Amino acid sequence: ENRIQIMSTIAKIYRAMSRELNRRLGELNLSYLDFLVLRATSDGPKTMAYLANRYFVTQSAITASVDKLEEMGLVVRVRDREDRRKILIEITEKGLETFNKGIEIYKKLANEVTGDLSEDEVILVLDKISKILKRIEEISQ
Amino acid sequence: ENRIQIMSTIAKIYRAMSRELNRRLGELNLSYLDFLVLRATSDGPKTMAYLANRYFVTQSAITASVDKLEEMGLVVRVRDREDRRKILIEITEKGLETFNKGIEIYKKLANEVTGDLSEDEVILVLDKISKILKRIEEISQ
Ligand SMILES: O=C(O)c1ccccc1O
Numbered sequence: 708e709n710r711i712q713i714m715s716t717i718a719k720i721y722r723a724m725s726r727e728l729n730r731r732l733g734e735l736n737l738s739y740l741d742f743l744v745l746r747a748t749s750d751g752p753k754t755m756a757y758l759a760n761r762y763f764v765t766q767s768a769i770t771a772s773v774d775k776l777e778e779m780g781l782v783v784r785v786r787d788r789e790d791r792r793k794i795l796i797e798i799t800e801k802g803l804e805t806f807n808k809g810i811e812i813y814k815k816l817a818n819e820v821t822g823d824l825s826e827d828e829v830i831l832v833l834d835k836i837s838k839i840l841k842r843i844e845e846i847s848q
Numbered sequence: 849e850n851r852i853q854i855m856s857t858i859a860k861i862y863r864a865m866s867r868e869l870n871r872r873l874g875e876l877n878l879s880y881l882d883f884l885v886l887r888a889t890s891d892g893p894k895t896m897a898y899l900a901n902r903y904f905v906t907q908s909a910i911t912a913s914v915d916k917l918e919e920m921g922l923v924v925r926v927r928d929r930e931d932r933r934k935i936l937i938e939i940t941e942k943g944l945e946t947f948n949k950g951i952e953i954y955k956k957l958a959n960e961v962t963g964d965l966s967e968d969e970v971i972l973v974l975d976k977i978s979k980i981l982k983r984i985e986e987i988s989q
């Protein structure tokens with residue numbers, strides 16, 4: 708039916724976008740997951756547990772991505788002054804610059820794929836799928 | 849902006865749905881990927897190359913899923929009568945029954961998450977995102 712098709716189309720869109728984003732972000736030496744980590748830390752330091760849960764990936768996956776971004780000088784592991792074991796992933800000046808370039812790549816791709824939709828159509832879809840998102844997040848966790 | 853948010857929301861919806869589908873399909877002894885393989889073969893035999901490309905996963909990932917479904921008796925590797933090396937993955941009677949149960953689980957979840965949307969709203973979203981899908985598939989491959 709139509710409700711199943713909306714979800715299946717959302718899934719197909721995600722896979723195709725993922726493939727293309729990995730390709731375009733590649734020029735910035737980033738994978739889609741690496742970019743997501745930068746996106747998440749761009750507005751404030753995040754725990755590695757948050758990153759794994761928010762993006763539904765394994766802890767080893769986050770560990771690999773963070774280690775990579777750290778070596779690239781895009782993020783740093785900040786430790787509490789009294790308990791060094793408490794770690795937060797913080798974006799660096801260079802990380803923010805790279806994240807910004809990544810946003811432009813994302814922006815350009817988004818404009819291309821939604822090209823057949825008018826501004827009003829875009830708005831109509833956005834407001835309605837935001838409801839779907841609220842519901843699935845309430846259900847899934 | 850709005851166009852970037854539509855794509856980012858589509859991604860967040862996909863991840864949350866993936867998490868929940870893996871949980872609910874678990875009672876059928878299937879992972880989301882296993883179910884997708886059944887979905888793909890439900891309407892006709894598919895090559896392993898097609899499965900990996902269509903769902904954007906690695907060949908080893910498809911190999912593992914097919915081996916599992918084969919052991920579960922849900923699919924079989926059919927070989928050409930003159931060139932046994934040419935392989936197609938075909939769904940079995942039992943596979944179709946399991947796939948059908950999987951569809952009902954998907955249907956129920958889809959109805960829950962799109963619950964705030966009227967039938968007309970559902971239709972409006974579906975027709976518009978179908979355009980987005982057409983475009984990203986043209987771009988990505
Ligand atoms: O990706 C999905 O969740 C899906 C579900 C049903 C039918 C086709 C699909 O791609």
Ligand SMILES: O=C(O)c1ccccc1O
Binds near residue numbers: 746813855859
């Ligand atoms: O998942 C995405 O592609 C995404 C992109 C931009 C901002 C937040 C996001 O989750």
